[PDB]
Write a protein that binds this ligand. Sequence first.
Ligand SMILES: [N+]
Length: 107
Amino acid sequence: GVQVETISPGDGRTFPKRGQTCVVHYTGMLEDGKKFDSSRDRNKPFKFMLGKQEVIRGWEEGVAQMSVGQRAKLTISPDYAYGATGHPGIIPPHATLVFDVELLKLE
Ligand SMILES: [N+]
């Protein structure tokens, strides 16, 4: 599943609901700490609509437990990310992913 650990608290009241657009900044890493993706490097926030499955299951379930303004570390198992096949060339098979995610606002 996905484990959510707080890095900096959000408002503790406003939680994402299915259908809303989450605007986040994130950095993805492999178990070892190797960065594979980061909206922060592109200095452009990433947006996705909750419930539309346009992101991995771990994001759908983990970001829904975060509140606006919160920054958390999500540790995601293979079955909630890219599974056995992974994404050859970027993500290994059966990879446990770690994401540093900050929820900036909801639209
Ligand atoms: N995959």
